[PDB]
């Protein structure tokens, strides 16, 4: 499960729908084994398309839980078009690519901060099925 996915996945429990604490999930730093996948090519158009939607505070929270606190406190902003990118823009977009797309949790677990339900990730795949 890619780091990007952590920025959109919320608790599946219905009672949590309107809870501010249903997102982001709380990832266990002692259980989550990370993988870097260099096979997914740099896609700067996708990143420009997604950035406005990205919840930066949630990025910071999950990344810190996973042992990365070397992130800027403010969400990176960009021009509105590929051609307007600077080398500095490009480098940050590249860092975003690595962070969001190329970094994944292969095995681990995470819980809802509202209801405490714990979700498990195995072979990169989160189990989002809800028990009786």
């Amino acid at each position: 499960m890619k780091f990007l996915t952590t920025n959109f996945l919320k608790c599946s429990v219905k009672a949590c729908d309107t809870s501010n604490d249903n997102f982001p999930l709380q990832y266990d730093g002692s259980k989550c084994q990370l993988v870097q996948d260099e096979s997914i090519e740099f896609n700067p158009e996708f990143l420009l398309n997604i950035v406005d939607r990205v919840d930066w505070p949630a990025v910071l929270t999950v990344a810190a839980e996973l042992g990365n606190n070397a992130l800027p406190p403010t969400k990176p902003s960009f021009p509105s078009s590929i051609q307007e990118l600077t080398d500095d823009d490009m480098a940050i977009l590249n860092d975003l690519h690595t962070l969001l797309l190329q970094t994944s949790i292969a095995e681990g677990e995470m819980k809802c901060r509202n209801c405490g339900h714990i979700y498990y990730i195995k072979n990169g795949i989160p189990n989002l099925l809800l028990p009786p």
Partner: protein, 175 residues
């Protein structure tokens, strides 16, 4: 009884491409693939549109097969009838091939849970196209009615409707 896996693959590829034509998306969008099975549709999302996607399926065996395909999207074990577990406005669009009729297997409650939470998970104006195999007209109307109550607009496309073999139904909706 059964269909050759290559034949199922060819048909699903064609329906996925048709769904994408109906969706008419900008390249490099963020897409939810609902009932993704073994990820064949996700492969096409990646290749055709350079899209980034998350795939949901109830079946461990399908997802395990998905793992063997070197997919670029994220697979998730989940049940579409329980709702779409993503925050508001996450996706540009959603696509579903050969899966939603499962919602009809309480069905009316699961159908509404599906459409309400999908409406929420799409960006404003986000689109959803689903190919599905209805058992009868009432099933079609029930699904369409549920989408309507949830706030979706749009309607239905039926390709090759004169053909009992080749007829296909596509729900084409906008939030």
């Amino acid at each position: 009884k059964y269909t050759g896996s290559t034949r199922v693959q060819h048909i699903q590829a064609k329906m996925t491409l048709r769904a994408l034509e109906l969706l008419n998306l900008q390249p490099c969008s963020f897409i939810l693939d609902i009932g993704c099975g073994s990820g064949l549709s996700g492969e096409i999302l990646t290749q055709e549109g350079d899209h980034v996607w998350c795939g949901l399926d109830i079946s461990p065996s399908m997802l395990a097969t998905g793992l063997s395909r070197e997919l670029e999207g994220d697979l998730m074990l989940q049940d579409m009838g329980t709702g779409i577990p993503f925050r508001a406005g996450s996706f540009d669009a959603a696509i579903s091939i050969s899966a939603i009729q499962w919602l009809c297997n309480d069905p009316k409650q699961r159908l509404m849970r599906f459409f309400n939470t999908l409406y929420a998970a799409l960006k404003k104006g986000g689109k959803f196209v689903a190919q599905f195999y209805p058992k009868n007209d009432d099933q079609v109307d029930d699904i369409l009615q549920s989408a309507k109550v949830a706030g979706f607009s749009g309607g239905l496309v039926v390709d090759d409707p004169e053909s009992k073999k080749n007829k296909k139904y596509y729900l084409v909706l906008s939030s």
